[PDB]
Design a protein around this ligand. Structure first.
Ligand SMILES: NS(=O)(=O)c1ccc(Nc2nccc(-c3cnc4ccccn34)n2)cc1
Length: 273
């Protein structure tokens, strides 16, 4: 019932295509216990979440039909590489994404694999989270929370806050915060910046499945060196988004109340489609 327009990309759960509903709507068409779980996400509707319009199960084949947006944040960041995304827009995008996370997390749904590629933007200054709740139904490790890397089986909504903190830092500096090319390189990049975690800062860390007493012990670096020129409000918020202990890590709801957002606005981006 769809005429494919073009290949828009490829995901962890199969290829995504721009398509026209043959019988005029323009959509994103993704070709992938699961059915019921995905059907749950059809009701999960929020302005900063990419709407899942339909789920089609035909011939052992599964199709997810989403609302179509025109650009992802990876493409936008690359396009804004010369002068950087203006700070007020970074703040607007962070604020909106925290609203979306706050909504999903309140419904006990986590993303688990946030990255610039599944953050979608439109001409009006909105940004939306794509692929929410799918995980629970080369792969980038850059935005992976330390508890996942250390083998925690039962991670929490805190994993998404970590990923978003990483993305926030990337928008500001125009460089990935922790660009690991393997699981241990990812972990050790985190440790080299934030200090190797211990029982003081993260109670229970030394008993985690993949923790090794042999991990090198690196000292923590000051945030003024890690994300210039983020102001003190932004640095404070980021540090709370990157706490090692998931229970100390700021929630989306609490983050929205942080002083960093006192002067938040909704600018219109310069989008070249
Ligand atoms: N790369 S880009 O900037 O030109 C560009 C990217 C995405 C879109 N739209 C769009 N819409 C709805 C859903 C998605 C979506 C969800 N999961 C994935 C995984 C891979 C590719 C797209 N998506 N994508 C337009 C353009």
């Amino acid at each position: 019932n769809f005429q494919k327009v073009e290949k828009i990309g490829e995901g962890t759960y199969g290829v995504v295509y721009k398509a026209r509903n043959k019988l005029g709507e323009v959509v994103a068409l993704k070709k992938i216990t699961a059915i019921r779980e995905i059907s749950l996400l059809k009701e999960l509707n929020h302005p900063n979440i990419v709407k899942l319009l339909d789920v089609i199960h035909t011939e052992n084949k599964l199709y997810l039909v989403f609302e179509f947006l025109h650009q992802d944040l990876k493409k936008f960041m690359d396009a804004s590489a010369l002068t950087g995304i203006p700070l007020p827009l970074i703040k607007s995008y962070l604020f909106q994404l925290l609203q979306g996370l706050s909504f999903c997390h309140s419904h006990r749904v986590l993303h688990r694999d946030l990255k610039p590629q599944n953050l979608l933007i439109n001409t009006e200054g909105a940004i939306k989270l794509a692929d929410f709740g799918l995980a629970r139904a080369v792969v980038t490790l850059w935005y992976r929370a330390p508890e996942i890397l250390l083998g925690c089986k039962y991670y929490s909504t805190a994993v998404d806050i970590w990923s978003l903190g990483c993305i926030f830092a990337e928008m500001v500096t125009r460089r990935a915060l922790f660009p690991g090319d393997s699981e241990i390189d990812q972990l050790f990049r985190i440790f080299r910046t934030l200090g190797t975690p211990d029982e003081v800062v993260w109670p229970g860390v030394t008993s985690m499945p993949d923790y090794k007493p042999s991990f090198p012990k690196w000292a923590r670096q000051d945030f003024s060196k890690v994300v210039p020129p983020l102001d003190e409000d932004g640095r404070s918020l980021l540090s709370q988004m990157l706490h090692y202990d998931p229970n100390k890590r700021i929630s989306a709801k609490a983050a929205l109340a942080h002083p960093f957002f006192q002067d938040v606005t909704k600018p219109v981006p310069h989008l070249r489609l």
